[PDB]
């Protein structure tokens, strides 16, 4: 048949950040074609496959990946059905037989599960997202932007890593995608005429030397309102504390980040702090707001915040569905970050986003910090209608990629379309 | 007939700044598609089309360039064979009938110029590379990668705008791009341990607060041989002087008081290259582009005398991808080799009639990115359909600049035993 | 898949002279075909493997060329896909295994080399110049037509072997061809009118018993003028001077042919014989004005007349990127005359005329001595726009025949085509 | 449909003497292709079509007939079934509606026949032999091969225009070929060794100053033996004497003063065959074209009736491919040969009838070149077609002379064990 699965081949490329990754084409009988490209990537998630031989690429190379695709996965799915998504993510599963895909390598595995789906969206002649979702696909996500970055990725004393907008007010994606454009450019202008540094980090965003937490964000309000929205209405802010970097006993402490004289703060006092930082700016999201294992932490902070502000694990539940079964049991967060990568299959990760989506918690599809010009995720977004997405700053064709790919996909869906900002909530 | 354009259609888009830009698609009626994206674009050159619409993307907006697009130039090319590159270049070229391609816009013609090429090669079920150079492809350009950078992309008191590795010495290209990648990872290091900014430019590069060009310089070597590479055997160095924005026309001089603070030197045309002549002598310097400004022919001529045989000497202002430019350099001895953008000339065709004339004049031809780019990777292959020999598309950072990169990757992978990797040998006009 | 090449096919043929050649059919799963002829064909080229039976064609049959190709080279590229012409051309030069190709026979290779790419051509749909050279194909070659010979190709007292034409003046290859017939009938009709004999040599031109060089040059001069053309304006002169028939020691020796009083130059005598004949008459191209051993002879020759005069190496490059290598480093000549079969793959004549053109020379694309039907140095003329073509006089259909098919690649180029003239003399 | 004729277009071209003539190519709906290439054409045969512009090629152009294909025929024929060869070619003759095809031109017309029966065995998938003939195709004919000139082609004292060699002894098509190309270049051996010319005229033979036809005619068999081969048994020789160029219509004789000076022969209708008969009995003549005048029927019946039993007498002028000439011929007792010449008729029907008339009345059909040729070979087909068992294709130099050998080589190779090749056994007439 025509649909069989012909071949499966694997190469080591670069990634955003100048390191190896690899990619994957996969062709059937009748010359369909699918590429698919992994991102850069706890002991229970999916772990990549490095090669280790310190004379390539400091030990980041991915031959041995690479040579797992060619040699092991390639043998045990050509033959398949390219449709055969489901059995083939099993396959591949089964094949490596280990939990973290550590025998074949998470990026080989998701590279084919990749390749695979979109060489058969290429064979039935339709597009990626409606191949993945079926007919009912329509939502165009609420993007939350990262603009400003602190913690680990600054030197200014500043203890949460990233610091978003999100243009919740605009009618379509093609409108949200300028308004964080614009609300972008507006602030490096700002940063300019302050003698702040506007080169970019890894996700496109700057990482100036601000005096701390409050004028990072006051100045990202200065720069929506210069470009002409309103805080609170048409853009709001999100914050990814990632608070493990900071979490050591029982408290976070700040000193790490923010000098000598910053609070340490018990699991009680970060919740009353993120609350007054709620109460006081326009938030409407905030990531990893407590520690990965703080989970009687994250249970009081969802209790007092979760209400009105979509509580984002990332760490907590590393695309790791019986993470995710306990939160949700639990009432730990309202929300998770989708890594691809971090699972490891298509797959799994639309099991993922199903069961949060069943439990009333938002699935944030995302980026990594390492990233390739494929543009998977801002399909896999409008697939599933997960209604929000997590893909960098305006700058970067790392991160500029998915959001074209969502002008396309909105654009093909013509008068289908739907933004639905705040809406997309559904989690508050 | 299966082979016929069926539609053209434009949108607009992001380039790598967050700046608009569009793309084009086309379709055959067989069903052949390819999508074109443009990259961001003095009296002489193309012009893209932007909105100056205040009220949207500060006035960046492509959305008048992706109208004609849509309701002028569609209408003329659909009924086309899609193979029928030239024709349809000089038809959109006859249809703007201006120029510098100001009325459609360098930007519509140049997407639909490259969409037309893919969707061309998608219908034959070829690479572009063999569809735009026929079956005598096969060279892996040596790469510029620009590392550190300076003058108006930098606060450091250095006057020349890029500063440039050429891992001239690698076997192939897959190799040549290791050795960039260590290079820019082991400067990274380097830097972070100088307490230097490692923060990235729109190209992928590093503007550290350097002490001055040769801290700049001697900063890159240190991280060649911290990577494991020799300077002068595996790697040498690359400048882009942009030296137009430190000319002083008026009293006729190079001012590095400019960039370089109060008291740096402000030299004559000859002590300008008399300075490039130091540098090239201290320093494993192989290629400098726009070494002397775009106006100064004479000077341009002494330099080409004076440093021209040993090194490549990269006109891009002084050319702006103009043949009537290029043509007047040829025949004054200005120059041996030639910055290639496909947007500042605005088609394929002209682009690579660009590329020939360089070829037999002894010149090079060096494809080259802009600062705002796309996911498209075209102009890698463009590089190796010309067996051009080298290429300038950024650092090692940022997919803007990868995404050529991997390209590349791909077409030597392709090319299997047939690929060739010249290294030092694509300088044919040294 | 249909793109594979299913058979390889060899037999012996005739050449314009009624001597063997060989052709060889490609076919393709798809049923697309291509035939390569081989024209007739130094220590350091190509050679063409001859049977050496004296009881068939006086020796020069090519069997054992053909029983390499249908029993040897065959089995080597079945399977190929047609388009992959640079492996084809390399696992053929690997399976003969010598530098010359006398294994299997430079004879062999070519036809096989040519029969694929015309095959190739075919699968695509496409013209054999645009699969050649890509989409970028557009000048037409401004011809160099023998119309005179002498030397080795006369009874006449005149050393030098070709006499050419060059319309560069015309406006189109059309109009060209037009200019080149008028002045090659003009001639004849002078011929008769002076008792001289009309009937033709082996490349379609004249070999009259002229008094020498000047009354052959004058009575060319004579036919541009009474076809209505300008010498030097509409119609320059070449020569072949073929130097090497009559160098031998240190010195030109004119006696050779013509005659007991002949001039004895040395090397500094040749050139400035070279330079007299440059400023008397209307020459724009000299082939082989030294010898193919006189490296200093052709560097000063160069050194003096360079500037404005195209100085062909034929025997002085044989189509060998290793001699050319050579010359373009010690500046010896300025053009290399382009024959396919003396270096017998098509990939190793592209890269000749690409090593030329990045040196600053012209490739002029040859006819051989004993020529076919074929008309592909055509479609290699305009396929790498080299700009110049020698292919005969303006009889014999083994010379019409290419410039038919530049007539029909330039009606085919419609508005696109360029006939470039004296500015594909990019060399001056 | 699929064989439908889409596309009819014509260009002039070059033929083997330099001068202008006329090809045509044919597209049916499907793709498949033909092109037609046309060579150079008294009150009753076809006449060609040429410009008369004396400001190009002499007056020699042909674009008036390429004018007539692309505006006129075009328009006509697109629209058949490219397999309809009669219907198209009846429909030609319809337009032209003139007895010699002067208003479209002959060879607008035959450019436009070739191509569609090229076109539609490109459809069929067949060979042209296969779709010309039918099945029963296997017949490589006996080529008479044109070695010396005289007469108008020649400057030597000989009045006969051609003399050639027929290679009947060969057991193969290929062999055949052998044996005239190792005599040719036995005889060029011999020309050179006596000072003779040895350059070539029109037909790729040689035009050398001999003494007179003996010298001529034994210089060729000097020739055949020095090839190894022998004359009378391996090889004959056939003559054209063309004797319509030397014979004097007021004094009704064959004045051979014209070509071989003062002294030379003046003979009478009776005198001439007398003459033939001697010629025919001292040397290996197994054919004789024109050797009565065009018309002197009464000579042409009473030399058939003199040497008709044992040598072949074919007219040329005599008949100029007419079959109401060649109708009368027949029923007069006149020659037992024609020399078939597509373009002196003007399309592939009307040659297949001249032939077939031919045929059922014992009369041997010898397709034939003319002066002017091109890299065509269509007459190579058309021979094994009809199994007409003998060609007229020139010399053993020059491509316009050779490709049809080559075809033969092909179509022998292509038939296998099913080809045959009967020497002797083709001149059924005698
Ligand atoms: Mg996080
Ligand atoms: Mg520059
Ligand atoms: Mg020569
Ligand atoms: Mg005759």
Redesign the pocket.
């Known amino acids: 048949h025509m649909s069989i699965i012909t071949d499966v081949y694997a190469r080591e490329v670069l990634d955003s950040r100048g390191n190896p990754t690899l990619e994957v084409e996969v062709y059937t009988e009748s010359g369909a074609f699918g590429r698919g490209m992994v991102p850069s990537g706890g002991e229970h998630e999916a772990v990549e496959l490095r090669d280790g031989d310190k004379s390539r690429y400091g030990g980041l190379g991915t031959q041995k990946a690479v040579d797992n695709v060619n040699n092991i996965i390639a043998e045990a799915i050509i033959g398949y059905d390219v449709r055969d998504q489901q059995a083939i993510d099993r396959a591949m599963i089964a094949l490596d037989g280990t939990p973290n895909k550590g025998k074949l390598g998470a990026n080989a595995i998701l590279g084919v599960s990749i390749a695979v789906a979109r060489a058969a969206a290429d064979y039935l002649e339709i597009p990626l997202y409606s191949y993945l979702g079926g007919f009912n696909t329509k939502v165009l996500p609420t993007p939350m932007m990262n603009i400003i970055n602190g913690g680990s990725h600054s030197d200014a004393p500043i203890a949460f890593?990233?610091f978003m907008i999100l243009p919740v007010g605009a009618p379509t994606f093609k409108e949200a995608l300028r308004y964080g454009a614009e609300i972008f450019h507006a602030l490096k202008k700002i940063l300019k005429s302050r003698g702040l540094e506007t080169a970019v980090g890894d996700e496109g965003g700057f990482a100036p030397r601000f005096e701390g937490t409050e004028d990072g964000v006051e100045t990202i309000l200065a720069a929506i309102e210069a470009a002409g929205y309103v805080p609170g209405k048409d853009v709001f802010l999100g914050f990814?504390?990632?608070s493990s970097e900071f979490y050591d006993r029982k408290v976070y402490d700040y000193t790490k980040f923010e000098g000598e004289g910053a609070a340490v703060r018990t699991s009680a006092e970060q919740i009353d702090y993120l609350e007054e930082l709620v109460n006081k700016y326009p938030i409407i999201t905030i990531?990893?707001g407590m520690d990965e294992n703080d989970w009687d932490g994250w249970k009081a902070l969802t209790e007092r915040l979760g209400k009105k502000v979509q509580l984002?694990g990332?760490?907590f539940f590393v695309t790791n569905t019986d993470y995710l079964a306990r939160g949700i049991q639990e009432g730990a967060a309202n929300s998770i970050?989708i890594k691809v990568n971090q699972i490891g299959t298509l797959t799994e990760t639309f099991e993922a986003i199903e069961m949060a989506k069943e439990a009333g918690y938002t699935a944030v599809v995302?980026h990594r910090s390492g990233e390739t010009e494929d543009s998977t995720i801002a399909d896999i977004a409008v697939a599933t209608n997960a209604g929000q997405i997590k893909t960098g700053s305006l700058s970067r064709t790392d991160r500029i990629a998915k959001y074209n790919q969502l002008l396309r996909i909105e654009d093909q869906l013509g008068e289908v379309a739907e933004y639905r900002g705040l809406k997309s909530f559904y989690n508050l």
Chains 1, 3 share one sequence.
């Open positions: 890593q990233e990814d504390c990632a990531e990893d984002v990332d760490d970050l995302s």
